[PDB]
């Protein structure tokens, strides 16, 4: 189905680099549909959340420093299978490992400043969706070009 | 001084184009600071005030209907001289007539369907950005990067 | 009215130095619809019936000679006030003094090599049109994206 | 051989997306010369005759049906391992899977609106240049930059 | 005359910011040969000559020390009307009233950060050259491609 | 550690292409830092020199033939894991095989002009730099962009 969402994130160092415009505009042109948006710097209380899967591992409290310490861009796109080709637009873990062509493989260097992240199966997606934005800032009627989908 | 913001609205033909990311790159190339962005679809009272100017004019009832038939993306940027230089980097309100290298030079065809508008002057900017923005929506501590300004 | 049409040709000197994409591009973004294009080494009866304005002066044999040198990408795009706004996309004769973000301004240097030509009005569009492509060449129904025009 | 030529067809949801441009530049900035190049809206017997290795096939009759449904852009491009090299440079048959730098990859998401499709062997590429141009529509001498080969 | 040449220096702000590649790649695409290139970091002597025209004024002192606070690309194109073209396509002094599509236009906001300079005439040309670069350090034979020049 | 260094040659093909602005742009992009840069025209000597490996097999005098045949780009970047990082955005050794996304998939079709050569290890990239460039030639003190390494 057509309808599939999934949670991206611009973090701190890809808003600080002046990246979300190239970023978004490869999900537009894949044809993904946009239907939320928006720039807010994270409270502690959404970050713990957000990485509430690692909170036993050692390196949780870095991943919640770093995500609250300047803006975020959040957004949500729609579109068949965009779980799983948002992750691969985005490259691997390490920046340094991704292929050419894709966000980390052409923009990164670190595994601590990789720019995005996108939601890893469509049931951490539809739990990230929830907690970063209300039901009002997400579209309901969506209508992607139509030379996209048969 | 260098805390002077403008507001942008891509408006319904601009999303519907896939142009939203195009258009941010833009401005964060030129070092502009992303201050505040959304997506949302207008209300009608929204829209009225926005164009209030024109109220007494017969157009004004297209403007309104127009801005509110589907997505806009919100925005507000920071920087020297912003207000003027958004405008510039826009285009003349006739598509046709806008310089290649200008957003509507470059995307658009049509007066009604001329992608994207700005505040025409600081004061107006101060009002649109109080309009469509919460003060909590936007970034109170601004650091654009170290080698843009003297 | 959105029916008018403007005939492009890439000179050979575009074709060679691999311009043909990015050209055709420009326009596509711009919102104009291509109805012709085809790839095609002129005669020099075609040449010199397409020059024939200028076929009383010294330079007319020059142009003739270059023209038939090697391949050229003949199209023709409609869409309102194509035929203007596809000069202003182009820049002036000489390519030194045309605007960046020009074709011409972004890509040439020499008078006699710059890379592009376009009608230069409606009458004289339609008499190139007609020189160059035969009618079943050319698309009779048109569909522009429902976002470009009110 | 440096002589090796592929038949490439821009299918009707290219054509509609404004691709044109962008993929033609991909295969002239790898240094492959254009041989043919036109568009046309196909005939239902060019159609059949193109896809009749699937004739048997259910899906036979809609690969038909959505290629004569609107303009298509066909060309011709020539070039070392240029057969195999374009089908690399398209991706795989599904848009999905195709990685981020490759035209499906970049553009697609459904498989039956997969942008462009390229001859997928030598001895096809062959029979598919044969219908679809006249020998009069294919230059016969050509030139590469002669920085491309040894 | 196709001789012709200026000195460019993208400063410690453009390459700072990542513009290198940019700013050459933009010189190249126009057709302009590329004659010298290096990156150093610029010595008083050196800045205080090549800013000489200004030593009276109060605001040389910062510019010597801007230049020479961290490393410099100077390199030196070749090519018809190469002085006043190089100097079309960096913008104006201000970058804030510098035309989208010119560098200064596209990438800066401010007077003193605006990252690039280029030579103002021929004379001033052959001067620079001199001081920042020894003979053998620039090319003697210069070969454009070929479709450039009539 | 982030202070690996890297050698890089634009060949003389990727010279001629007008390429060098493309490729260092990649880099720039990528977070590496430009450490030296320089045109020259090599010369026999530097030429053996730097293909020493190979100088026991038939194909080395090609090699330096075509080397020290016209310009080259010599640079330097500087980086964590930039070595291995510079090969993966190269590509392999047959630009036909290379991904689309990579420098060699996307400009390149012939093994003999394959546009650009990095260092194959830190071992040799240590030995290429210090043949290629005097240690004043490089930067001492290098400064990344800060969002780039945690």
Same mark, same amino acid.
Do not use: C
């Given at each position: %189905?057509?309808?599939?969402?999934?949670?991206? #994130?611009?973090?701190?160092?890809?808003?600080?680099? =002046?990246? %979300?415009?190239?970023?978004? #505009?490869?999900?537009?042109?894949?044809?993904?549909?946009?239907?939320?948006?928006?720039?807010?710097?994270?409270?502690?209380?959404? #970050?713990?959340?957000?990485?509430?899967?690692?909170?036993?591992?050692?390196?949780?409290?870095?991943? %919640?420093?770093?995500?609250?310490? =300047?803006?975020?861009?959040?957004?949500?796109?729609?579109?068949?299978?965009?779980?799983?080709?948002?992750?691969?637009?985005?490259?691997?873990?390490? !920046?340094?490992?991704?292929?050419?062509?894709?966000?980390?493989?052409?923009?990164?260097?670190?595994?601590?400043?990789?720019?995005? #992240?996108?939601?890893?199966?469509?049931?951490?997606?539809?739990?990230?969706?929830?907690?970063?934005?209300?039901?009002?800032?997400?579209?309901?009627?969506?209508? !992607?070009?139509?030379?996209?989908?048969?």
């Amino acid at each position: %189905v057509n309808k599939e969402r999934t949670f991206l #994130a611009v973090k701190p160092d890809g808003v600080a680099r =002046g990246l %979300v415009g190239e970023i978004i #505009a490869r999900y537009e042109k894949k044809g993904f549909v946009l239907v939320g948006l928006k720039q807010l710097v994270p409270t502690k209380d959404l #970050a713990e959340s957000h990485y509430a899967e690692h909170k036993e591992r050692p390196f949780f409290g870095g991943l %919640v420093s770093f995500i609250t310490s =300047g803006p975020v861009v959040a957004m949500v796109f729609e579109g068949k299978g965009v779980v799983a080709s948002a992750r691969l637009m985005i490259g691997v873990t390490n !920046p340094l490992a991704s292929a050419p062509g894709s966000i980390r493989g052409d923009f990164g260097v670190d595994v601590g400043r990789n720019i995005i #992240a996108g939601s890893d199966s469509v049931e951490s997606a539809n739990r990230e969706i929830a907690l970063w934005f209300k039901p009002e800032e997400l579209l309901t009627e969506v209508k !992607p070009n139509p030379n996209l989908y048969e």
